[PDB]
Amino acid sequence: AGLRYGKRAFVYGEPPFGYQDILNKLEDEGFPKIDYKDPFFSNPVDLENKPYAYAGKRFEISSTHVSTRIPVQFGGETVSVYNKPTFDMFSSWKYALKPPTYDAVQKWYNKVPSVHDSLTHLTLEIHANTRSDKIPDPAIDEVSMIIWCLEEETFPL
Amino acid sequence: LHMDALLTKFNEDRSLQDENLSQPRTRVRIVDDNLYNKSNPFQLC
Amino acid sequence: ALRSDVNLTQYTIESAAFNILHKRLPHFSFESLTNMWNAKKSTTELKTVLNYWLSRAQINI
Amino acid sequence: MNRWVEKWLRVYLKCYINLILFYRNVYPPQSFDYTTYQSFNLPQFVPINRHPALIDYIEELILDVLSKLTHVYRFSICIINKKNDLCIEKYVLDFITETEVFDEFRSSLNSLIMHLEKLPKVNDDTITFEAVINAKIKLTSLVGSDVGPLIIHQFSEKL
Amino acid sequence: MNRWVEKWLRVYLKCYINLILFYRNVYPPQSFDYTTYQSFNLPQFVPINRHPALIDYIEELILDVLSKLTHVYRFSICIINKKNDLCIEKYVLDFSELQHVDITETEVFDEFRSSLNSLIMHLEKLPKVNDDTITFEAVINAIELELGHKLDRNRRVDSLEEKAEIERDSNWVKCQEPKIKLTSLVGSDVGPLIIHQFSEKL
Amino acid sequence: GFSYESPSQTLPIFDAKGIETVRRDGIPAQQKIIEKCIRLLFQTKDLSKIKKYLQNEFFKIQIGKVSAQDFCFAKEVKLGAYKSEKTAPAGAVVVKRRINEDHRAEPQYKERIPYLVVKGKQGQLLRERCVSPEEFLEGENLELDSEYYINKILIPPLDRLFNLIGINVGNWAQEEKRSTTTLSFLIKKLKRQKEYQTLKTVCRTCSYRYTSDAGIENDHIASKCNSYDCPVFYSRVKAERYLRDNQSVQREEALISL
Amino acid sequence: MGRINNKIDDISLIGRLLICGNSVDFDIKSVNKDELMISLTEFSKFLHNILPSISVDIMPGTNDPSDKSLPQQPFHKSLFDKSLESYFNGSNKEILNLVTNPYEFSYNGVDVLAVSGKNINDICKYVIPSNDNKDDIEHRLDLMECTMKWQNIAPTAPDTLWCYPYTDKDPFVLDKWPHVYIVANQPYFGTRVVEIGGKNIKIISVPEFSSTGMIILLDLETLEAETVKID
Amino acid sequence: MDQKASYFINEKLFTEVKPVLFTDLIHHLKIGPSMAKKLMFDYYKQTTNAKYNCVVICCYKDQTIKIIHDLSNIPQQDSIIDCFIYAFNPMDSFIPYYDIIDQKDCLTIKNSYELKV
DNA sequence: CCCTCCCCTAC
Ligand code: SF4
What we know:
By secondary structure, chain A is of the alpha+beta class. Chain A has helices at 21-28, 102-110; strands at 10-11, 70-71, 89-95, 122-124, 127-128, 143-145, 148-150. Chain A has a two-stranded antiparallel ribbon with strand order 4-7.
């Protein structure tokens, strides 16, 4: 059939929730069905205890950095180490950050980053010579150009 | 002919002559008469 | 009419032409147009002012 | 000694079960807390379920396994495929300073993260999980704790 | 003396990592381009990758290694297979006392040129590695330090230096140390920088 | 907020009401800044990216790397419907100062007269400076009031929008042989010269609509374009001011002594 | 230097070397002083190694650290390594001479007018809907012949020239015909002798050395240009 | 001398791993260009331990210089007036490095002018 | 530290 259990084995009780009833029971307990992301600081330096209050409304703004995240608690109490570390000589260490994927670099490189039923229309403009940028006056400045245009779309005959 | 045959034909019969290296051949003299005369037309401030 | 129809900032001929027709028109002062229209030489300047006012009249339609 | 290994094994098993539950589709995402807690000072995000009933169930399972830790030699968490009743995957954990056990559990959990985050995705509503206590297979050897006298081996199966 | 060595060592590590990633087909060769300037004058025309994420990754790794330099005496770029996590190749860069704190840059670049030429001549003889799930890793051997234990005080950060120190202390995990084949190479014998090279296969 | 009028709609619609991104009672710069900040808040929920962007914008405004067009107000002026002279708005002062020199320069009813703000002495009410774009681009020593602009046109609306979240934006604003320096000066000068040549080529191509010419006198006709509705004009006058200055660096001794 | 050809009887007849522009390729949009200094030190190494054997006349180009206009001044006494400080002391100018972008070298009486090639490259950036009754070597040679005919080195003034080229006496308006007219930084190579009013001018189109690295050897006894390809 | 040259080439090829040119032999042994080519060819001979890639260039007529890459299809073998070894490369990518050289007495052609100091 | 006057946006 499938993966065998072993020579001597036991089984624990069945969990209470499934894939569908999980959110329906999470809402009935007094929690939002989906907890969206609150405004947060990605840089823990820019925190500066900004969310203090505003007009008597206390806000809780934190960061997602490793320095601000609290450790996982087991039983309501945070489990942390209190004693000083014991550094031993001749140790070995490994980088934890995962490098980019081969396929990611290739996908980045391939993208190469009959009847008249309207109104006739006529337009007119005027050019008048001025005297040292004086916005020509209709009492001392005369007309020189009466360029006009007729809308040929609606014009009949 | 292969590449080794060309080398065998050319380098084995090297002349290695006239390479005194003590009295080298003087390059032919070519002067620029416009070096000091006057008035370079394209020289602006 | 453009002020009532569309909501933009300056409501000038160049601004309206660029925001409605996507056409960028140069703008010359009233003294520059006068100096061009009084140039005995430089047919280019006369053609410039003529096409200036012709485009201003054609864009109104 | 037996003091720090108990608490650190509790935390390690909690993170282990929560990671196996979240990185697969045993329970849906958006049901975990992916940006609040840290597991063992690791830079990666650790998901913890939000429903207090499931967290209490996991904690009670861990306490019941640790209460009889002397008799058990293997604690496996099987992934059962619904409508077929066939265990697709089976992640298995086989069986004196606070810093040593801390670093060993840190390395083991980091190896578990690196192994889980590179697996093929799973469709929804097809998997139920079942933990078993031992009182064509594709095997993978993970990092385990060797310093403490309670040496544990970590390996996973598939198909 | 920490005055100029921190730049020359950075350039050397950059060229080292880029050559290892290029000649072993860890990344597509089209993403590499032979250059001489990558924010630092390189000693050769070294093929440097131009991926935005990979450049930052390599720079952060090199800065972390240079910060831990005072206790690190060995740095290895391990080439692990992806179908199974097993080191098939390992390029060790020894740091035996490094002639550290206790100089005609042209000579330093000449020594780096010799070392990189030896590395390239060694890499050009290995069989071609297929793409598609070949990857790499990074392992260091320290003298006396314990990493991952700086987050036990909640360490309220004040500037970028403290945040960098925290994220560099937390970015490393502990690890442990058949038909191995060791091949020694040419190192850097310049006064302040006494570096040695090694290699491992099979 | 982001509006989704249908489940099939993938990209959201930036639907704003009443806020400074739809009101014409400000400057085009504040609209872009506020819209960018709101999009950054709605998409990434990241308060650090918003802070970095705002600090960069404030630093650019303080230095003087702005377009000088996005800082132009535009308000309708009812030149006859005002109670008195001391209650006239900022635009009416500019309008009257222009009428006094040319009575024919009187705007129509509900006309949009633009104006800018500059620096002043102690006091110097907002109405007292009130320079128009023409007066500002021809003034010898005139710089935008970076303090007034930044504070009183950027800090109040961002304070409202981000105090609805719980962060104060005002605190983010208060926070013979030479081959290196000479070569840096050459790089700067050549970059500025290439930018100036590109702007001149753009203006010469734009002026082809009227002249239908390409040789000389086309650059001459295009050099008299004072279209205040074009961003290339402000950049052109800024490039001209930069090229006509800094004569100390552009000499026989450019820190190279020869 | 006579190391490759080994015919010192013929290599010793190359009296001078003339770099006609485009010595370094970069974009001033995104560049700093470091990489430009690297390229300049490479060029300075070349100069220091070749100067004890041959004389060099360096000329600015279109993409070199110099003015973007056509009358580009000499590069600088700086921008070169400190190893060349003995050549820039003032007395050693016959072996190394930083020269203006247009220049009329009087090489033993053979007046040769040399241009880096921005005038023709600025004429060719237009598309004239005439001349029908395409980017070929003969077309650029005809353009150079017409530049010599019109007696104007830069017909497109707003593109090549800059503000204040001169006052009342423009330098680009030719006042004297040269013997050889060199326009460099061209895609192809080609020569042509033209007869304009009983005179004779030899036009030479020098191709780039980056791609198709040919070197033109111009004689001064008969004005015959031969090419030397390097692969 | 064929003894100092061989030792120098072996050193600069295996201990200080770098591509050695014939001009390097010119500068180190103070010899002419033809003698340097002869010594390079002599070192190319007697090469039972061959661990390098020779870089051969040939000069055709009409003053053309080519670097042979295929070594199997040499175009116009009748027009070749010279063909010598340019360098010994231990690696595959040639990519040499060029530094300052003090050509005080290794010059075969001097310019008509002298450096005035 | 409150008033009027002005701008203009949303139902
Ligand atoms: S500035 Fe604006 S308007 Fe004046 S020319 Fe250039 S583009 Fe046309």
